[PDB]
Amino acid sequence: GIVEQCCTSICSLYQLENYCG
Amino acid sequence: FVNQHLCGSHLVEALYLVCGERGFFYTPK
């Protein structure tokens, strides 16, 4: 989930935007 | 600012700035 993708590894815009409404 | 390790409030801030009026969901698990 987001923590594994963005906190414990390096985040990306692609991934963040999957969590936008 | 997004292409780094982002945790806790730093992650929430990034979602807030990127998502804007779309809103977002933060589900840390």
Swiss-Prot record, chain B:
The protein's name: Insulin B chain
Biological classification of the source: Eukaryota, Metazoa, Chordata, Craniata, Vertebrata
Transmembrane segments: none
First-to-last residue of the parent protein present: 25 to 53 of 110
Superkingdom field: Eukaryota
